[PDB]
Design a binder for this molecule. Structure first.
Ligand SMILES: CCCCCCCC/C=C\CCCCCCCC(=O)O[C@H](COC(=O)CCCCCCCCCCCCCCC)COP(=O)(O)OCCN
Ligand SMILES: CCCCCCCC/C=C\CCCCCCCC(=O)O[C@H](COC(=O)CCCCCCCCCCCCCCC)COP(=O)(O)OCCN
Ligand SMILES: CCCCCCCC/C=C\CCCCCCCC(=O)O[C@H](COC(=O)CCCCCCCCCCCCCCC)COP(=O)(O)OCCN
Ligand SMILES: CCCCCCCCCCCCO[C@@H]1O[C@H](CO)[C@@H](O[C@H]2O[C@H](CO)[C@@H](O)[C@H](O)[C@H]2O)[C@H](O)[C@H]1O
Ligand SMILES: CCCCCCCCCCCCO[C@@H]1O[C@H](CO)[C@@H](O[C@H]2O[C@H](CO)[C@@H](O)[C@H](O)[C@H]2O)[C@H](O)[C@H]1O
Ligand SMILES: [Cl-]
Ligand SMILES: [Cl-]
Ligand SMILES: [Cl-]
Length: 508
């Protein structure tokens, strides 16, 4: 009686919401405690029972602030080291970002309480997943979006991993929210109905992990090299850094020519405008072709548009065998989804002169097309996403092609130091290779450089913060997974009919 009465105090539920929210962060890399996601969601769903609507929104806000406050605070690293702002505003922006993200999880908990106030089996297993889908969709969409920390990504090695190739990661977000809601109902009402339903709903997708939607092509097996140039962020875009960077990347590549069919350099590895590097690129391209090797590398490219102005792109270019270099070549990719404040500054005229954080080197990029053809090298088809774009599962899936041999992502994660950010980023990358049943080549500056197999497994990786090259054999795969054929409109029809059924019963 006294114990139950203590838990139903509102100031206590808030404190418990921080702890239960923060606990979610342990589900993602580098911690990888996948049950922490179920614990964290049970907290969010149980802690909101039997509360007023605006009371429940306060609890849902604090849960997110525990989650995002402990999970994405690594943004502080990049803001502190390169932001050039005083201490208090630096942490104010980090708490500001974590508070903004928490609106979407507070909005979720408010709506769920007004429309479904009774702690029923319908509000936890039907209304909650659908409304979560909507609010999480809204979080990853408004103001360019930021869909970081979705619990489905923690199931990359867990029992739900067979579900991603069929409906994508957001279906795992859906099921985890649902199974966690039945467990939460099973405790508060001390009923075994929801427990047995939750354990079967959770266990049913386990045999899925054994379906191989893909077929490996061992005849196409190559040696690939990815050079981790380890250029320090503070010097990377300094003009005096360029010759050293070119020497590092070139010296690592020349001895592998004739041995590695494909060589990859990371995001904007060549830190100069493509048009200023034509003697280098031409000489390099001829050298690659004589030996039978192809190179894909990041670079910056300012290109003249229709209205006689320059659009500067964050771009990948290709060179060498089966991909002869030209400034007029179409074998290239321009980053489409730009990172806010790092690659473009909203309200540019107001914010640019405030602090170096709002005027970072090369923070004036344009956006390439949403859909772009694969890169082509040696006869290999590479679906490309640059850095952050690899976490956008639908966008990656929409650029995917049936004749894609590998997924390719190149990234520069040095902004985030030795924090957990690079590992969270790396983990989400792995979900794309599982969803689409292709290997993924990840070339980074110092971030996690690795080759990911067609089921999300780590085939190879080199350690962070070192100047080395990962050279390994990799094998393409062919074949279409259900999620490749569809994207996530099926999950959206489930979200719609659950959300419809749920809103119906609540209109009584
Ligand atoms: C009953 C108990 C309830 C208590 C509720 C608590 C819930 C949990 C609370 C917090 C969880 C999250 C805490 C992490 C927050 C910050 C972590 C931290 O400080 O370590 C950060 C560094 O942490 C690290 O990255 C350590 C190294 C980890 C990488 C090496 C191991 C990798 C493991 C592989 C992971 C999976 C990859 C794929 C393999 C399957 C600090 O970084 P910094 O550059 O020095 O500056 C950071 C300034 N912000
Ligand atoms: C409404 C409330 C919002 C709060 C406003 C302030 C808080 C924003 C805090 C952080 C925003 C971004 C922090 C700096 C990140 C810089 C990374 C970057 O852009 O670099 C590039 C990074 O590109 C990548 O995709 C690699 C990894 C990026 C992962 C993204 C993680 C940070 C995203 C946080 C932004 C949050 C969105 C805002 C909410 C809608 C590459 O480096 P470079 O080519 O050598 O040169 C960079 C070009 N100048
Ligand atoms: C208000 C109570 C809500 C309870 C639950 C019912 C909510 C409605 C449920 C389902 C809406 C039906 C939408 C399915 C249509 C599918 C179309 C389609 O394939 O496009 C999909 C995306 O298009 C959409 O689904 C649009 C988003 C639908 C939002 C509908 C919710 C209304 C928004 C305001 C509601 C605010 C809370 C309610 C306030 C009382 C697939 O593309 P993607 O990969 O998700 O894009 C990612 C880019 N960031
Ligand atoms: C205090 C901070 C604000 C609190 C609440 C925030 C509400 C802000 C108003 C909601 C509308 C914001 O305006 C937002 O701008 C960007 C424009 O890039 C749009 O998003 C835009 O880029 C995305 C990329 O994912 C495209 O998919 C989208 O089609 C496009 O319109 C958002 O769809 C739009 O909603
Ligand atoms: C409640 C019962 C509902 C049963 C669903 C039966 C379909 C009717 C509802 C959808 C209407 C048309 O159905 C449509 O089919 C195509 C073929 O996969 C889907 O997919 C199509 O559009 C998407 C973009 O959204 C493309 O990325 C995709 O390449 C294309 O094939 C559409 O997203 C879906 O909207
Ligand atoms: Cl009190
Ligand atoms: Cl019930
Ligand atoms: Cl050729």
């Amino acid at each position: 009686m006294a114990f139950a009465s203590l838990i139903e105090r509102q100031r206590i539920r808030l404190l418990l919401a921080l702890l239960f929210g923060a606990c979610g962060t342990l589900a993602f890399s580098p911690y990888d405690v996948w049950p922490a996601a179920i614990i964290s969601l049970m907290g969010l769903q149980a802690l909101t029972f039997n509360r007023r609507p605006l009371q429940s929104a306060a609890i849902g806000f604090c849960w997110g602030f525990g989650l995002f406050g402990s999970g994405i605070n690594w943004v502080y690293v990049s803001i502190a080291t390169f932001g050039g702002m005083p201490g208090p505003v630096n942490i104010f922006l980090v708490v500001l970002l974590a508070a903004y993200l928490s609106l979407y999880t507070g909005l979720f908990a408010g709506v769920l309480s007004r429309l479904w106030p009774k702690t029923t089996w319908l509000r936890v297993a039907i209304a909650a997943p659908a409304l979560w889908q909507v609010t999480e969709f809204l979080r990853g969409w408004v103001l360019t979006g930021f869909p970081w920390l979705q619990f489905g990504y923690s199931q990359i090695d867990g029992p739900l991993k067979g579900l991603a190739p069929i409906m994508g990661v957001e279906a795992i977000n859906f099921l985890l929210m649902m199974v966690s809601g039945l467990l939460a109902l099973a405790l508060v009402k001390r009923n075994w109905r929801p427990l047995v339903v939750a354990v079967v709903l959770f266990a049913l997708p386990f045999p899925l992990r054994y379906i191989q939607w893909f077929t490996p092509q061992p005849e196409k097996t190559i040696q690939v090299s990815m050079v981790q140039g380890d250029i320090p962020q503070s010097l990377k875009w300094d003009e005096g850094q360029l010759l050293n960077t070119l020497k590092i990347y070139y010296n690592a590549t020349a001895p592998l020519m004739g041995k590695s069919s494909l060589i990859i350099w990371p995001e904007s590895a060549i830190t100069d405008l493509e048009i200023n590097q034509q003697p280098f690129l031409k000489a390099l391209d001829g050298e690659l072709r004589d030996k039978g090797s192809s190179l894909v590398t990041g670079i910056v490219d300012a290109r003249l548009n229709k209205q006689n102005r320059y659009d500067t792109y964050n771009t990948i270019i290709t060179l060498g065998k089966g991909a002869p270099y030209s400034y007029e070549s179409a074998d290239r990719y321009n980053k489409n989804h730009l990172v806010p404040f790092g690659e473009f500054v909203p309200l540019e005229s107001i914010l640019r002169p405030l602090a170096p954080f709002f005027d970072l080197p090369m923070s004036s990029f344009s956006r390439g097309p949403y859909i772009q053809p694969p890169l082509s090298a040696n006869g290999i088809e590479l679906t490309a996403a640059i850095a952050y774009e690899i976490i956008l599962g639908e966008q990656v899936r929409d650029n995917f092609r049936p004749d894609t041999d590998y997924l390719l992502t190149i990234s520069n994660d040095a902004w985030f130091g030795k924090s957990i950010g690079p590992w969270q980023h790396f983990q989400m990358a792995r979900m794309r290779a599982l969803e689409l049943a292709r290997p993924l080549l990840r070339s980074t500056n110092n971030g996690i450089t690795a080759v990911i197999g067609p089921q999300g497994e780590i085939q190879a990786m080199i350690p962070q913060f070192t100047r080395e090259v990962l050279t390994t054999n990799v094998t393409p795969t062919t074949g279409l997974t259900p999620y490749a054929r569809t994207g996530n409109w099926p999950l959206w029809v489930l979200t719609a009919l659950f959300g419809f059924a749920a809103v119906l019963m609540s209109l009584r």
